[PDB]
Amino acid sequence: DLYDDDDKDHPFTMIPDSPGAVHQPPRILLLYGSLRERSYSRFATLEAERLLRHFGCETRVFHANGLPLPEDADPSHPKVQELRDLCLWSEGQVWTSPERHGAMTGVMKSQIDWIPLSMGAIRPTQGRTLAVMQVSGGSQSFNAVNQMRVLGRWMRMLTIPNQSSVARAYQEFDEAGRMRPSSYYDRIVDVMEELVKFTLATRDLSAFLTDRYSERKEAA
Amino acid sequence: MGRDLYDDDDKDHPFTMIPDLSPGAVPPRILLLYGSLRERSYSRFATLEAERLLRHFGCETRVFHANGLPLPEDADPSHPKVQELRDLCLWSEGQVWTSPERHGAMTGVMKSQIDWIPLSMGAIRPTQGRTLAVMQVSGGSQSFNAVNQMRVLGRWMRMLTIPNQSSVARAYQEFDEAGRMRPSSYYDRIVDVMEELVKFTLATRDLSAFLTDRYSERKEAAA
Amino acid sequence: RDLYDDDDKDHPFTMIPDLPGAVTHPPRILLLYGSLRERSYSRFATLEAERLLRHFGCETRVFHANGLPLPEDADPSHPKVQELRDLCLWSEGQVWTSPERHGAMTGVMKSQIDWIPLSMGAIRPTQGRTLAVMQVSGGSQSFNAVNQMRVLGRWMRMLTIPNQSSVARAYQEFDEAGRMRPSSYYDRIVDVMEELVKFTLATRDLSAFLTDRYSERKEAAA
Amino acid sequence: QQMGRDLYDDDDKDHPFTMIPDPGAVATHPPRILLLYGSLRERSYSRFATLEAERLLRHFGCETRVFHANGLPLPEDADPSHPKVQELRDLCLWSEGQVWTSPERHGAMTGVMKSQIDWIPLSMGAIRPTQGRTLAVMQVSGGSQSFNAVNQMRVLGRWMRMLTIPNQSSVARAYQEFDEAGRMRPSSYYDRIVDVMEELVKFTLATRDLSAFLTDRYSERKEAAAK
């Protein structure tokens, strides 16, 4: 008996409603997607980092140079452990991937593949916010960001609505790597703003948001 | 005077705002059972069970039925069904999309329903800011084609799609003749989903206007 | 002897595929669906594709979803539904042209395909037929619609040819009469229809042979 | 409105460069490369599915090669001279058809598979290593039978200008279907796998001879008209 809900375990049910505030937001940016020597995903990641630091975030950027393919080495590997620890530190993340062969990169997906959903006592991605972005040498398409939104859902991360797709990125960055004024840059600014907003509005409730009826019900 | 920033040349200094207020509220949850208007529709039954749970969590719920809805632009937007859906969508603070997997993808009914809702009705954005939970029923395996397409669609309706989702495999095995769902892990996941949706709706519905206050739009101060 | 490294196969139902009944104007049906708007750029692109297909030697039909009810909002008796089903059976190849509405295929397009059963008893109206996917958009050149329909082709067991068309800012590419101005977009449409006819000629004669699957023969349960 | 000397209802068609679509040829046993990529796990069910599919392809008359991604660096983490990269590229050229079998890790194809495909340029100067070659997509999963990986790979095939055959394989709870030696237990999943390899060989034989003709596009001929 559970108020016209036959299958519910009455003790494991809880109404959603809490206090708490923090001072800070850790945001890790995964420029992943290109280890290229001039990589526009890297330059876009760094512009996003500038914007996040202006918006009040503490930012770390992981470079996958020397990261082996998933399961090509033992997880003791330094790059793997760096990525896992940085994710642990993260409260939100930024995935910026070029559109290689009409999809997210092998680098991006390899980085996420090295991250366990549950690492012992820690769940490194669950509850953390996520903003997905993509650069492209051609048209403004969304193959990469679409795949990454779905992946975010499989990381039990809160993927923010807004996203940015930079078409023909080589035309938007100078030789130094800074991005020229454009609607693309403004969309990136909107995206980073929204990411910080959503991180502030949720980072305190992550433990409560991940308290699920299913998990409590297995209290048998 | 007043202008200019240190390392970021491209920003319009006045249009920049640090993200940081608002009070509480009462939460409207609109459920679109769309996907099958079949006379025994398992998507309909799952929608109704989700509504039971949502009302148990304290929600005011509306459920729209697409019976008689014409294809997008097959009738004037004056159409009663179209206006009902638009008004309910404005009423909503969060939503539930439950669609079967027809031909390995979301249905034309669901997609037609969303196609009838404009992103911008003049000054109003009917979906922006509202939360969203996507679920799917299937006669076969537990796949995610429909829910994946619907997560992306959520991204295009500027809605906050919650991470968790429900996919009912062999849905015909899970509902009795009355329409109630038998005990299974699927029901537990649906409860998880409605719980998370209500949590996120409460955690955002008061700040929705602030979250959609975007630097680009403020920069559009061209006058 | 009863096999050679493959324990699970029922040896009698196994067949090696070789060269197998060898052939005219290839039926290619175009589903302009995606817009019932009066001025629909998907419609104009569909008609340009039909012009090109007929120049390449095809017999073409174009179905309009005007008045088609939502799937199961009416009995399959509906004239539009049976018209579409019969046209689909007639087809040897198809063209699905959908605008990108809400970043995805339209409800019109998907509703049209939903009215088509994968198997209507013993006959499957989609199996074996070729497919070319194209998309028009009011904005950027994206691929959401063509990607979703490329997958749908696999779920309709249709052979979707590699090349596809994505028309960016279609309003800029069509005059008021509906003809498309010269562009890389039009040339790509021509490439797509050429490839579609090429692949249709290479498959229409083997369609029965290609759909003779080990699973089906193994069910020889007497 | 200067319009060349021929045309008819098609103002935009360059009358020169237009061609009517068609010849016979027998590499008689079709080269089919299988990329077990997706898992370098030591017991990888993707690998075992690849090997059973290879058995079936060889019985149906195909010459088969299987590439293992052990030691392949991430794309652009090393010079393309790297031995692993060059082996993969050469096998790709040798290929007339392919099989992509990837597990569904985190609800999508893996970084291993996509890194392998990212190492293959669409055009290395004048040659296209994937164009025209057939493609069969399959996936293994630790849970239910989903299609995220196979769908992403079906789209990738189009972007690799490959002809992806309709049928596909999705093996649910692969651990339940494989012995300790690596052979697959009898199941509907195995029947689908053979169906897929059958269709792949059928389409490879029906297209490998016309691929050059199939890849002759109005666009390329029209741009080959320079003055």
Q: What does the H/E/C string look like for chain C? A: CCCCCCCCCCHHHCCCCCCCCCCCCCEEEEECCCCCCCCCHHHHHHHHHHHHHHHCCCEEEEECCCCCECCCCCCCCCHHHHHHHHHHHHCCEEEEEEECECCECCHHHHHHHHCCCCCECCECCCCCCEEEEEEECCCCCCCHHHHHHHHHHHHCCCEECCCCEEECCHHHCECCCCCECCCHHHHHHHHHHHHHHHHHHCCCCCHHHHCCCHHHHHCCCC
> How far is it, in rounded angstroms, from Cα D208 to Cα A75?
43
SS3 content of chain D, % helix, strand, coil (to 5): 35, 15, 50
Strand, helix or coil for residue C180: strand
Q: Which residue has the tokens 């979906």?
A: B127
Cβ-based contacts of D184 with chain C (< 8 Å): 8
> How far is it, in rounded angstroms, from Cα A164 to Cα B155?
12
> How far is it, in rounded angstroms, from Cα D39 to Cα D69?
9
DSSP secondary-structure letter at C126?
A: S
Strand, helix or coil for residue A59: strand
Q: Which residue has the tokens 């959603």?
A: A16
Across the interface, whether the CB atoms of A66 and D76 are under 8 A apart is answered: no
Within a domain: C7 = no
Contacting residues for A19 by C-beta, under 8 A, at least 6 apart: none
For residue C99, list its beta bridge partners.
C136
> Which amino acid would we find at residue B59?
C
Within a domain: C86 = yes
Identify from A139, A162, A187 which residue to disrupt to test chain C contact, counting C C-beta atoms within 10 A and taking the largest count.
A139
> How far is it, in rounded angstroms, from Cα D150 to Cα D170?
8
D148 touches chain B (CB under 8 A): yes
Sign of the Cα pseudo-torsion (B188, B194, B198, B200, in order):
positive
Name the neighbours of D, counting chains with at least 3 Cβ pairs within 8 A.
A, B, C
D2 touches chain A (CB under 8 A): no
> How far is it, in rounded angstroms, from Cα A87 to Cα C108?
43
Sign of the Cα pseudo-torsion (C71, C74, C75, C76, in order):
negative
Report in angstroms the alpha-carbon separations of D192 from D186, D196, D198. Answer: 11, 6, 10
> How far is it, in rounded angstroms, from Cα C68 to Cα C81?
7
> How far is it, in rounded angstroms, from Cα A218 to Cα A162?
36
Cβ-based contacts of A214 with chain B (< 8 Å): 185, 188-189, 191-192
DSSP secondary-structure letter at C94?
A: E
**C52: nearest Cα among C113, C100, C105, C95:** C95
**A160: nearest Cα among A122, A114, A113, A194:** A194
**Parallel, antiparallel, or unpaired: how do β-strands B131-137 and B60-64 relate?**
unpaired
**B128: nearest Cα among B204, B72, B202, B62:** B204
Residues 59-88 on D with a CB inside 8 Å of A are 69-77
Report in angstroms the alpha-carbon separations of D21 from B3, C186, C198. Answer: 64, 19, 6
Q: What phi, psi does D82 have (nearest 5°)?
A: -45, 140
> For residue D36, how far is the Cα from the chain centroid?
12
How far does the CA of residue D173 sit from the closest CA of chain B (Å)? 12
> How far is it, in rounded angstroms, from Cα B73 to Cα C108?
9
> How far is it, in rounded angstroms, from Cα B20 to Cα A196?
9
CB atoms within 10 A of CB B166: 24
> How far is it, in rounded angstroms, from Cα A164 to Cα A177?
18
> For residue D106, how far is the Cα from the chain centroid?
22
For residue C132, list its beta bridge partners.
C95
Q: Which two tokens stand for residue A162?
A: 């807004």
Cβ-based contacts of B53 with chain A (< 8 Å): 5
- Among left, alpha and beta (phi > 0; psi -120 to 50; other), residue A52 is alpha
CB of B20 closer than 8 Å to CB of B94: no
The helix (run of H) or strand (run of E) holding residue C110 is helix C107-114
Which of A36, A68, A113 shows the shortest C-beta gap to D110? A113
**D214: nearest Cα among A131, C131, C199:** C199
> How far is it, in rounded angstroms, from Cα A10 to Cα A219?
12
D105 touches chain A (CB under 8 A): yes
> How far is it, in rounded angstroms, from Cα B147 to Cα B135?
6
> How far is it, in rounded angstroms, from Cα A54 to Cα A44?
15
Q: Which two tokens stand for residue C203?
A: 């498959």
CB of B206 closer than 8 Å to CB of B25: yes
> For residue B80, how far is the Cα from the chain centroid?
21
Within a domain: C3 = no
- Among left, alpha and beta (phi > 0; psi -120 to 50; other), residue C28 is beta
CB of B138 closer than 8 Å to CB of B168: yes
State the distance between the two ends of chain D, measured CA to CA, in whole angstroms: 20
> How far is it, in rounded angstroms, from Cα D138 to Cα D183?
16
Within a domain: B8 = no
C113 touches chain A (CB under 8 A): no
Across the interface, whether the CB atoms of A70 and D109 are under 8 A apart is answered: no
Identify from B138, B144, B166 which residue to disrupt to test chain D contact, counting D C-beta atoms within 10 A and taking the largest count.
B144
The helix (run of H) or strand (run of E) holding residue C150 is helix C144-155
Strand, helix or coil for residue B113: helix
**A210: nearest Cα among A128, A127, A150:** A127
Helices (H), chain B: 42-56, 80-91, 108-115, 145-156, 185-204, 208-211, 215-219
Residues 187-216 on C with a CB inside 8 Å of D are 187-188, 190-191, 194-195, 197-199, 201-203, 206, 209-210, 213-215
> How far is it, in rounded angstroms, from Cα D49 to Cα D108?
18
Question: Taking each helix axis from N to C terminus, what angle separates C184-201 and C41-55, rounded to the nearest 10 degrees?
Answer: 50
Q: Which two tokens stand for residue B4?
A: 């200019």
**Parallel, antiparallel, or unpaired: how do β-strands D63-67 and C159-160 relate?**
unpaired
Within a domain: B12 = no
Q: Which two tokens stand for residue A168?
A: 């023909």
CB of A194 closer than 8 Å to CB of A163: no
The helix (run of H) or strand (run of E) holding residue C200 is helix C184-201
Asked how this structure was determined, the answer is: X-ray
Range list of β-strands (E), chain D: 31-35, 63-67, 97-103, 134-140, 163-164, 169-171
Report in angstroms the alpha-carbon separations of A213 from A1, A125, A202, B196, D180. Answer: 16, 20, 19, 10, 37
Within a domain: B122 = yes
Chain breaks in chain C (C to N over 2.5 A) after: 20, 23
Across the interface, whether the CB atoms of B113 and C107 are under 8 A apart is answered: yes
Contacting residues for D210 by C-beta, under 8 A, at least 6 apart: C198, C202, D22, D23
Report in angstroms the alpha-carbon separations of B103 from A122, B143, C211, C218, D125. Answer: 39, 12, 18, 25, 40
Q: Which residue has the tokens 């001279």?
A: D81
Name the neighbours of B, counting chains with at least 3 Cβ pairs within 8 A.
A, C, D
> How far is it, in rounded angstroms, from Cα D39 to Cα D112?
7
> How far is it, in rounded angstroms, from Cα B190 to Cα D17?
58
**B212: nearest Cα among B106, B115, B120:** B120
Give the alpha-carbon dihedral of D80, D84, D90, D92, to 10 degrees. -100
Across the interface, whether the CB atoms of C143 and A140 are under 8 A apart is answered: no
**Parallel, antiparallel, or unpaired: how do β-strands D63-67 and D31-35 relate?**
parallel
> Which amino acid would we find at residue D166?
P
Within a domain: D187 = yes
Report in angstroms the alpha-carbon separations of A184 from A166, A190, B100, B159. Answer: 6, 10, 36, 21
Contacting residues for A218 by C-beta, under 8 A, at least 6 apart: none
Q: Which residue has the tokens 């010269």?
A: C182
> For residue C50, how far is the Cα from the chain centroid?
14
Q: Taking CA atoms, what residue in A is nearest to D130?
A: A101
DSSP secondary-structure letter at C11?
A: G
**B138: nearest Cα among B95, B177, B106:** B106
Measured in residues, chain C has a length of 222
> Taking CA A4 as the corner, what is the angle to CA B26 and CA A8, rounded to the nearest 5 degrees?
95
Contacting residues for D43 by C-beta, under 8 A, at least 6 apart: none
CB of A101 closer than 8 Å to CB of D121: no
Across the interface, whether the CB atoms of B188 and A213 are under 8 A apart is answered: yes
CA gyration radius, chain C = 19
Containing structural domain, residue B193: 20-223
> How far is it, in rounded angstroms, from Cα B196 to Cα B163?
9
**D118: nearest Cα among A101, A137, C7:** A101
> How far is it, in rounded angstroms, from Cα A160 to Cα D166?
35
Range list of β-strands (E), D78-171: 97-103, 134-140, 163-164, 169-171
Count interface pairs C-D at CB distance under 8 A.
Answer: 125
> How far is it, in rounded angstroms, from Cα C74 to Cα A15?
42
Report in angstroms the alpha-carbon separations of C216 from C14, C15, C210, D85, D147. Answer: 11, 12, 12, 41, 22
CB of B198 closer than 8 Å to CB of A16: yes
Report in angstroms the alpha-carbon separations of B148 from A198, B46, B166, D147, D225. Answer: 22, 18, 11, 11, 45
> How far is it, in rounded angstroms, from Cα C181 to Cα D1?
12
Identify from D185, D218, D222 which residue to disrupt to test chain C contact, counting C C-beta atoms within 10 A and taking the largest count.
D218
Number of compact structural domains in chain C: 1
CB of D163 closer than 8 Å to CB of C153: no
> Which amino acid would we find at residue C176?
E
For residues B122-141, one letter each, b for 16 or more C-beta atoms within 10 angstroms of the residue's C-beta and e for the rest, the string is: eeebbbbbbbbbbbbbbeeb
DSSP secondary-structure letter at B126?
A: S
Overall resolution, Å: 2.6
Give the alpha-carbon dihedral of C60, C199, D197, C23, to 10 degrees. 80
Within a domain: C115 = yes
Question: Taking each helix axis from N to C terminus, what angle separates D111-118 and A106-113, rounded to the nearest 10 degrees?
Answer: 160
CB of B169 closer than 8 Å to CB of B163: no
Question: Taking each helix axis from N to C terminus, what angle separates C107-114 and C144-155, rounded to the nearest 10 degrees?
Answer: 0
Q: Which residue has the tokens 């490879």?
A: D204
